[PDB]
Tab-separated table of C-alpha atoms and ligand atoms in Angstrom:
chain	number	residue	atom	x	y	z
A	1	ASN	CA	82.108	142.975	89.416
A	2	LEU	CA	84.165	146.231	89.219
A	3	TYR	CA	87.303	144.324	88.349
A	4	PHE	CA	88.321	142.137	85.476
A	5	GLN	CA	89.380	138.781	86.835
A	6	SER	CA	92.234	137.254	84.902
A	7	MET	CA	92.268	133.573	83.984
A	8	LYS	CA	95.953	133.480	85.035
A	9	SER	CA	97.131	131.530	88.051
A	10	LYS	CA	96.924	133.146	91.480
A	11	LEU	CA	99.927	131.145	92.637
A	12	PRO	CA	103.482	132.295	92.723
A	13	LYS	CA	105.599	131.273	89.748
A	14	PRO	CA	107.673	128.547	91.492
A	15	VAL	CA	104.533	126.958	92.851
A	16	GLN	CA	103.037	127.101	89.333
A	17	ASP	CA	106.062	125.289	87.946
A	18	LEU	CA	105.883	122.707	90.701
A	19	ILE	CA	102.230	121.923	89.866
A	20	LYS	CA	103.030	121.632	86.137
A	21	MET	CA	105.966	119.345	86.846
A	22	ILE	CA	103.923	116.955	89.006
A	23	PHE	CA	100.886	116.915	86.683
A	24	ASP	CA	103.049	116.563	83.559
A	25	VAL	CA	101.188	114.165	81.265
A	26	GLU	CA	104.171	113.803	79.006
A	27	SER	CA	106.148	112.324	81.922
A	28	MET	CA	103.317	109.913	82.697
A	29	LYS	CA	103.444	108.779	79.085
A	30	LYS	CA	107.195	108.342	79.037
A	31	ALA	CA	106.991	106.179	82.097
A	32	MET	CA	104.422	103.951	80.373
A	33	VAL	CA	106.612	103.736	77.304
A	34	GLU	CA	109.599	102.741	79.463
A	35	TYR	CA	107.569	100.019	81.093
A	36	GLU	CA	106.670	98.754	77.634
A	37	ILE	CA	102.945	98.929	78.313
A	38	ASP	CA	100.667	98.644	75.350
A	39	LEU	CA	99.314	102.092	75.192
A	40	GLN	CA	96.407	101.369	72.862
A	41	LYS	CA	95.123	98.566	75.207
A	42	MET	CA	96.017	100.347	78.389
A	43	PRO	CA	96.091	104.153	77.960
A	44	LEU	CA	96.746	106.388	80.901
A	45	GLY	CA	92.996	106.811	81.592
A	46	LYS	CA	92.451	103.044	81.856
A	47	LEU	CA	94.772	102.365	84.796
A	48	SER	CA	92.800	101.476	87.933
A	49	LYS	CA	93.405	100.663	91.600
A	50	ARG	CA	91.549	97.338	91.449
A	51	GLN	CA	93.693	96.294	88.495
A	52	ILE	CA	96.872	97.295	90.343
A	53	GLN	CA	95.841	95.490	93.553
A	54	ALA	CA	95.156	92.269	91.610
A	55	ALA	CA	98.500	92.551	89.828
A	56	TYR	CA	100.290	92.980	93.180
A	57	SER	CA	98.582	89.767	94.434
A	58	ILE	CA	99.800	87.943	91.376
A	59	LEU	CA	103.330	89.093	92.083
A	60	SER	CA	102.987	87.791	95.712
A	61	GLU	CA	102.035	84.396	94.350
A	62	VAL	CA	105.094	84.479	92.116
A	63	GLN	CA	107.167	85.266	95.175
A	64	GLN	CA	105.620	82.363	97.101
A	65	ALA	CA	106.341	80.066	94.160
A	66	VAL	CA	109.971	81.233	94.062
A	67	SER	CA	110.515	80.609	97.809
A	68	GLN	CA	108.385	77.530	98.383
A	69	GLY	CA	108.722	75.677	95.054
A	70	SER	CA	107.186	76.119	91.612
A	71	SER	CA	106.256	74.275	88.444
A	72	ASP	CA	106.603	75.606	84.879
A	73	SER	CA	102.906	75.509	84.491
A	74	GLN	CA	102.280	77.622	87.536
A	75	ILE	CA	104.866	80.219	86.553
A	76	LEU	CA	103.538	80.537	83.010
A	77	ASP	CA	100.024	80.962	84.350
A	78	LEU	CA	100.979	83.693	86.771
A	79	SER	CA	102.920	85.518	84.060
A	80	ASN	CA	99.939	85.282	81.658
A	81	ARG	CA	97.593	86.568	84.336
A	82	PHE	CA	99.928	89.463	85.227
A	83	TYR	CA	100.339	90.603	81.603
A	84	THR	CA	96.561	90.363	81.042
A	85	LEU	CA	96.116	92.933	83.843
A	86	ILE	CA	99.017	95.093	82.691
A	87	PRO	CA	99.208	94.562	78.894
A	88	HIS	CA	102.601	94.414	77.348
A	89	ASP	CA	103.431	95.914	73.922
A	90	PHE	CA	104.228	93.070	71.513
A	91	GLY	CA	105.746	95.622	69.202
A	92	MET	CA	108.511	95.831	71.768
A	93	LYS	CA	110.825	93.074	72.904
A	94	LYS	CA	109.367	89.914	74.562
A	95	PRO	CA	108.345	90.496	78.195
A	96	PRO	CA	110.199	88.702	81.053
A	97	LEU	CA	108.776	85.449	82.373
A	98	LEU	CA	108.059	86.207	86.072
A	99	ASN	CA	110.209	83.483	87.668
A	100	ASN	CA	112.849	85.292	89.644
A	101	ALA	CA	113.254	87.851	92.381
A	102	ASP	CA	114.682	90.621	90.224
A	103	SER	CA	111.726	90.524	87.797
A	104	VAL	CA	109.270	90.332	90.654
A	105	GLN	CA	110.834	93.297	92.322
A	106	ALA	CA	111.075	95.363	89.095
A	107	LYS	CA	107.357	94.731	88.428
A	108	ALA	CA	106.359	95.597	92.000
A	109	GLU	CA	108.254	98.880	91.661
A	110	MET	CA	106.460	99.491	88.368
A	111	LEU	CA	103.128	98.939	90.106
A	112	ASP	CA	104.039	101.411	92.898
A	113	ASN	CA	104.780	104.095	90.251
A	114	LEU	CA	101.718	103.283	88.159
A	115	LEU	CA	99.433	103.581	91.159
A	116	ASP	CA	100.617	107.137	91.814
A	117	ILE	CA	100.401	107.901	88.096
A	118	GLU	CA	96.787	106.655	88.119
A	119	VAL	CA	96.112	108.873	91.100
A	120	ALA	CA	97.664	111.874	89.382
A	121	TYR	CA	95.767	111.214	86.196
A	122	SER	CA	92.359	110.763	87.807
A	123	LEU	CA	92.778	113.955	89.803
A	124	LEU	CA	93.724	115.667	86.588
A	125	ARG	CA	90.748	114.479	84.535
A	126	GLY	CA	88.257	114.694	87.366
A	127	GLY	CA	86.697	117.881	88.692
A	128	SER	CA	84.601	120.445	86.851
A	129	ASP	CA	86.468	120.737	83.521
A	130	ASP	CA	84.939	124.180	82.933
A	131	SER	CA	87.013	127.385	82.453
A	132	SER	CA	85.560	128.975	85.653
A	133	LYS	CA	89.273	129.110	86.758
A	134	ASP	CA	92.941	128.489	85.726
A	135	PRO	CA	93.894	124.807	85.159
A	136	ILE	CA	96.968	125.257	87.359
A	137	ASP	CA	94.925	126.515	90.314
A	138	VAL	CA	92.286	123.813	89.899
A	139	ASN	CA	94.991	121.079	89.965
A	140	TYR	CA	96.681	122.748	92.893
A	141	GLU	CA	93.386	122.598	94.881
A	142	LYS	CA	93.014	118.890	94.135
A	143	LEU	CA	96.202	118.182	96.099
A	144	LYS	CA	94.435	119.287	99.333
A	145	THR	CA	97.860	120.550	100.362
A	146	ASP	CA	98.969	124.056	101.234
A	147	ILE	CA	102.234	124.835	99.449
A	148	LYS	CA	104.256	128.011	100.104
A	149	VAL	CA	107.701	129.077	98.972
A	150	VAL	CA	110.156	129.326	101.954
A	151	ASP	CA	111.997	132.643	101.842
A	152	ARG	CA	115.596	132.024	100.889
A	153	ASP	CA	117.003	134.207	103.651
A	154	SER	CA	114.771	132.774	106.407
A	155	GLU	CA	116.116	130.611	109.202
A	156	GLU	CA	114.368	127.529	107.847
A	157	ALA	CA	116.020	127.944	104.463
A	158	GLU	CA	119.484	128.343	105.986
A	159	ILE	CA	118.973	125.227	108.126
A	160	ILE	CA	117.616	123.260	105.148
A	161	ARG	CA	120.409	124.248	102.756
A	162	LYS	CA	122.890	123.318	105.452
A	163	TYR	CA	121.299	119.855	105.872
A	164	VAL	CA	121.668	119.357	102.103
A	165	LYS	CA	125.194	120.695	101.777
A	166	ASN	CA	126.527	118.680	104.699
A	167	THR	CA	124.761	115.359	104.010
A	168	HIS	CA	125.748	115.279	100.322
A	169	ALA	CA	128.942	113.288	99.657
A	170	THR	CA	131.891	112.526	97.305
A	171	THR	CA	130.848	108.833	97.364
A	172	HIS	CA	127.721	109.025	95.151
A	173	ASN	CA	129.680	111.533	93.076
A	174	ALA	CA	127.626	110.830	89.965
A	175	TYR	CA	126.046	114.245	90.688
A	176	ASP	CA	126.150	117.254	92.988
A	177	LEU	CA	122.871	118.698	94.243
A	178	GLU	CA	121.657	122.261	93.978
A	179	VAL	CA	118.535	123.494	95.763
A	180	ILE	CA	116.270	125.348	93.337
A	181	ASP	CA	113.219	125.935	95.547
A	182	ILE	CA	112.118	125.037	99.058
A	183	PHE	CA	108.412	124.663	99.692
A	184	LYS	CA	106.613	124.465	102.996
A	185	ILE	CA	103.792	121.997	102.737
A	186	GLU	CA	100.865	121.051	104.890
A	187	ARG	CA	98.566	118.225	103.824
A	188	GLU	CA	94.938	118.658	104.961
A	189	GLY	CA	94.191	116.480	108.023
A	190	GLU	CA	97.756	115.241	108.515
A	191	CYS	CA	98.621	117.416	111.541
A	192	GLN	CA	95.574	116.013	113.428
A	193	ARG	CA	96.408	112.414	112.441
A	194	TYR	CA	99.986	113.013	113.600
A	195	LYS	CA	99.134	114.560	117.024
A	196	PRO	CA	98.931	111.405	119.222
A	197	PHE	CA	102.333	110.257	117.880
A	198	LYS	CA	103.868	113.631	118.681
A	199	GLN	CA	103.785	112.302	122.270
A	200	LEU	CA	106.504	109.750	121.464
A	201	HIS	CA	110.082	110.941	121.952
A	202	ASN	CA	112.791	110.826	119.268
A	203	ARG	CA	111.040	112.916	116.663
A	204	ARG	CA	113.327	113.524	113.656
A	205	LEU	CA	113.315	115.516	110.440
A	206	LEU	CA	114.337	113.139	107.695
A	207	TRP	CA	114.569	112.885	103.914
A	208	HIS	CA	112.288	110.875	101.621
A	209	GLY	CA	112.982	110.812	97.913
A	210	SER	CA	110.709	109.498	95.151
A	211	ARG	CA	110.093	109.810	91.436
A	212	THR	CA	108.593	113.033	90.274
A	213	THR	CA	105.619	111.257	88.700
A	214	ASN	CA	104.664	110.023	92.205
A	215	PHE	CA	104.302	113.397	93.911
A	216	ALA	CA	100.715	114.143	93.021
A	217	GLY	CA	99.781	110.905	94.775
A	218	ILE	CA	102.134	111.570	97.644
A	219	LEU	CA	100.659	115.053	98.321
A	220	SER	CA	97.003	114.107	97.906
A	221	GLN	CA	97.217	110.909	99.990
A	222	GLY	CA	100.427	111.185	102.011
A	223	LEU	CA	103.181	108.638	102.328
A	224	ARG	CA	101.812	105.078	102.436
A	225	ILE	CA	102.880	101.592	103.374
A	226	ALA	CA	102.923	99.146	100.574
A	227	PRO	CA	99.661	97.179	100.661
A	228	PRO	CA	99.240	93.616	101.999
A	229	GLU	CA	98.857	92.330	98.437
A	230	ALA	CA	102.369	93.580	97.531
A	231	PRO	CA	105.227	91.118	97.529
A	232	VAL	CA	107.751	91.288	100.374
A	233	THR	CA	110.725	90.826	98.004
A	234	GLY	CA	113.295	93.542	98.297
A	235	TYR	CA	111.957	95.258	101.402
A	236	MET	CA	115.107	95.216	103.559
A	237	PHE	CA	113.121	95.997	106.731
A	238	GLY	CA	109.707	95.023	105.530
A	239	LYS	CA	106.729	97.060	104.466
A	240	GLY	CA	107.003	100.441	106.045
A	241	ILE	CA	107.860	104.051	105.229
A	242	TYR	CA	111.574	104.565	104.659
A	243	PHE	CA	113.587	107.716	105.394
A	244	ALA	CA	117.253	108.716	105.319
A	245	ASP	CA	119.244	111.155	107.456
A	246	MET	CA	121.521	111.904	104.496
A	247	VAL	CA	120.171	113.671	101.447
A	248	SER	CA	122.541	111.598	99.230
A	249	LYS	CA	120.712	108.397	100.155
A	250	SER	CA	117.158	109.713	99.584
A	251	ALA	CA	118.165	111.435	96.374
A	252	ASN	CA	118.866	108.042	94.756
A	253	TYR	CA	115.162	107.249	95.090
A	254	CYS	CA	114.346	110.214	92.855
A	255	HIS	CA	115.661	108.039	90.007
A	256	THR	CA	116.659	111.206	88.170
A	257	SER	CA	118.670	110.968	85.030
A	258	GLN	CA	120.877	113.108	82.930
A	259	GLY	CA	117.820	113.401	80.645
A	260	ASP	CA	115.673	115.009	83.344
A	261	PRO	CA	118.011	116.196	86.067
A	262	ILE	CA	115.603	117.700	88.553
A	263	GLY	CA	114.001	115.784	91.370
A	264	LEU	CA	111.799	116.299	94.372
A	265	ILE	CA	112.564	115.217	97.905
A	266	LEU	CA	110.575	115.590	101.083
A	267	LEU	CA	111.571	116.480	104.583
A	268	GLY	CA	109.178	114.829	107.028
A	269	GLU	CA	108.873	114.931	110.776
A	270	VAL	CA	108.855	111.307	111.837
A	271	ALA	CA	107.935	110.117	115.344
A	272	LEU	CA	110.489	107.326	115.743
A	273	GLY	CA	110.084	106.533	119.467
A	274	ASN	CA	112.383	103.722	120.595
A	275	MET	CA	114.367	102.399	117.639
A	276	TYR	CA	115.045	98.741	116.896
A	277	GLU	CA	118.549	99.072	115.512
A	278	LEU	CA	119.771	96.587	112.882
A	279	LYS	CA	122.825	95.864	110.692
A	280	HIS	CA	121.195	93.672	108.001
A	281	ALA	CA	117.912	92.834	106.293
A	282	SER	CA	115.061	91.375	108.295
A	283	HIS	CA	111.487	91.344	106.993
A	284	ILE	CA	109.336	92.748	109.789
A	285	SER	CA	105.862	91.522	110.694
A	286	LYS	CA	105.676	92.384	114.418
A	287	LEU	CA	108.016	94.777	116.299
A	288	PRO	CA	109.525	94.077	119.759
A	289	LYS	CA	107.606	95.729	122.575
A	290	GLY	CA	109.008	99.097	123.577
A	291	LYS	CA	109.990	99.801	119.933
A	292	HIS	CA	108.019	101.995	117.501
A	293	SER	CA	110.389	102.020	114.480
A	294	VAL	CA	113.477	100.435	112.936
A	295	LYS	CA	116.886	101.954	112.311
A	296	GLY	CA	119.224	100.342	109.812
A	297	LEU	CA	122.761	101.246	110.878
A	298	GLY	CA	125.118	102.451	108.105
A	299	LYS	CA	128.915	102.837	107.781
A	300	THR	CA	128.416	106.635	107.554
A	301	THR	CA	126.335	108.882	109.842
A	302	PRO	CA	125.772	112.626	110.270
A	303	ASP	CA	128.049	113.941	113.018
A	304	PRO	CA	125.823	113.742	116.140
A	305	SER	CA	127.744	116.569	117.860
A	306	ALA	CA	126.801	118.908	114.930
A	307	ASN	CA	123.062	118.127	115.400
A	308	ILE	CA	120.458	120.815	115.971
A	309	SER	CA	116.889	121.095	117.253
A	310	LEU	CA	113.858	122.821	115.741
A	311	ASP	CA	110.498	122.499	117.603
A	312	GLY	CA	112.174	119.855	119.715
A	313	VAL	CA	112.592	118.185	116.333
A	314	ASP	CA	116.097	116.721	115.894
A	315	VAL	CA	117.755	117.789	112.666
A	316	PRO	CA	120.788	115.557	112.078
A	317	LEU	CA	122.588	117.961	109.733
A	318	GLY	CA	126.154	117.211	110.773
A	319	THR	CA	128.691	116.395	108.068
A	320	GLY	CA	129.041	112.664	107.319
A	321	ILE	CA	131.436	110.738	109.526
A	322	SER	CA	132.314	107.038	109.731
A	323	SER	CA	129.792	105.550	112.138
A	324	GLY	CA	132.403	103.142	113.543
A	325	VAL	CA	129.714	100.546	112.921
A	326	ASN	CA	130.919	96.939	112.903
A	327	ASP	CA	129.647	94.417	110.341
A	328	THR	CA	126.924	96.197	108.405
A	329	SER	CA	126.075	95.974	104.736
A	330	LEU	CA	124.403	99.446	104.724
A	331	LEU	CA	126.398	102.418	103.470
A	332	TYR	CA	123.927	104.792	105.175
A	333	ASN	CA	121.399	104.906	108.015
A	334	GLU	CA	117.736	104.256	107.231
A	335	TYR	CA	114.664	104.764	109.430
A	336	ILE	CA	111.386	102.925	109.011
A	337	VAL	CA	107.942	103.387	110.579
A	338	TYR	CA	105.036	100.992	110.282
A	339	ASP	CA	102.075	103.321	110.832
A	340	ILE	CA	101.238	106.083	108.325
A	341	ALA	CA	100.269	108.441	111.112
A	342	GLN	CA	103.861	108.534	112.501
A	343	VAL	CA	104.766	110.942	109.630
A	344	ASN	CA	104.136	114.661	109.267
A	345	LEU	CA	105.390	116.104	105.994
A	346	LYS	CA	106.936	119.575	106.417
A	347	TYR	CA	108.976	120.541	103.338
A	348	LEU	CA	109.339	119.685	99.656
A	349	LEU	CA	112.577	120.519	97.898
A	350	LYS	CA	113.119	120.857	94.236
A	351	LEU	CA	116.737	119.991	93.410
A	352	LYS	CA	119.011	120.167	90.431
A	353	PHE	CA	121.199	117.112	89.911
A	354	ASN	CA	124.440	118.251	88.279
A	355	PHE	CA	125.907	114.962	86.945
A	356	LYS	CA	129.610	114.427	86.179
B	401	2YQ	C1	109.031	101.687	99.361
B	401	2YQ	N1	109.481	102.884	100.124
B	401	2YQ	N2	108.483	103.412	101.012
B	401	2YQ	C2	108.976	104.464	101.641
B	401	2YQ	N3	110.240	104.627	101.150
B	401	2YQ	C3	110.613	103.678	100.202
B	401	2YQ	C4	112.005	103.594	99.487
B	401	2YQ	C5	112.622	104.754	99.739
B	401	2YQ	N4	111.921	105.818	99.245
B	401	2YQ	N5	112.410	107.108	99.562
B	401	2YQ	C6	113.563	107.260	100.369
B	401	2YQ	O1	113.999	108.390	100.593
B	401	2YQ	C7	114.219	106.145	100.912
B	401	2YQ	C8	115.307	106.348	101.737
B	401	2YQ	C9	115.977	105.280	102.304
B	401	2YQ	F1	117.110	105.606	103.199
B	401	2YQ	C10	115.544	103.977	102.017
B	401	2YQ	C11	114.450	103.802	101.160
B	401	2YQ	C12	113.770	104.870	100.604
B	401	2YQ	N6	114.065	102.541	100.818
B	401	2YQ	C13	112.783	102.357	100.113
B	401	2YQ	C14	112.521	101.355	99.257
B	401	2YQ	C15	112.123	100.180	99.877
B	401	2YQ	C16	111.637	99.145	99.126
B	401	2YQ	C17	111.515	99.285	97.762
B	401	2YQ	F2	110.902	97.791	96.778
B	401	2YQ	C18	111.872	100.495	97.151
B	401	2YQ	C19	112.344	101.544	97.896
């Protein structure tokens, strides 16, 4: 042409850092190490969906054996089959026999994380690996998600920072949160998928935290419901998509540590409709007619008189008050939907966790 075209990224610097953080191979590897996976038998590139599906089904059979009665033989078999799919490093300490709810639930949570890691990794290795363009921009494109920095002095940013400041507490005072960057995101196709559900009333802007190593999968594919193969163990309100109205609650699901103290949390617009309100666990197959979601009532709720609207989207950013709620085990509210299309992701926050 007339111009020299640099091989540098065409993205702004905070977006570049976001892409590097979510495609960080070192983090993928650390996760594998923490799970004690044998990395020579099962390297990052060897993880597959079919493998993960089959391992979930095994865990469901373990769960059925725990609730409905087991033999030693059966349990040993299921453990052997699980570890054949997800090989364990014998250089490390003996792996747990899968014969109890905690182990089942820890392994299911491993599989959720590994699935998103596999997604990230396959996106990363796929494509034209030619230098026709910057690696950062190529990996950005693969997310099929528009990501823009929200200007810090814009209305949106002031509202968002307020939602964070107010709904962060002195209870989970392990850390305070600091907003580093606010991104506006739009996943390809999601607005169209969401449209019909926009018709329902009670649309709310709610938090959803997750591990950083899951975000490539989250952005490329959107928030998902655990598959049918996955065990039900540990799903307080069954297999759906869970959100909080207090940033403190969602931030726990970032599983950030003093070692890596930055996490990512979403704000999504969720079409709740009529809410089935509950005070304790209850695994949900069907929902009562008239209801389109569940709300788990907590001891603490954002002050409803300090609530705001956006596009006719309720933003419950009031400071946390005692809900007055009688006989509940939940510290905080939760909201669950059972159809992936009831969610429209709007923002992604990068936060600093300042531990004490
Ligand atoms: C599995 N899952 N799917 C969507 N969200 C989630 C988790 C969770 N993710 N992110 C959140 O912010 C969150 C906010 C809550 F108030 C409550 C939540 C969550 N419970 C969820 C939970 C449930 C079962 C489980 F074995 C692990 C974690």
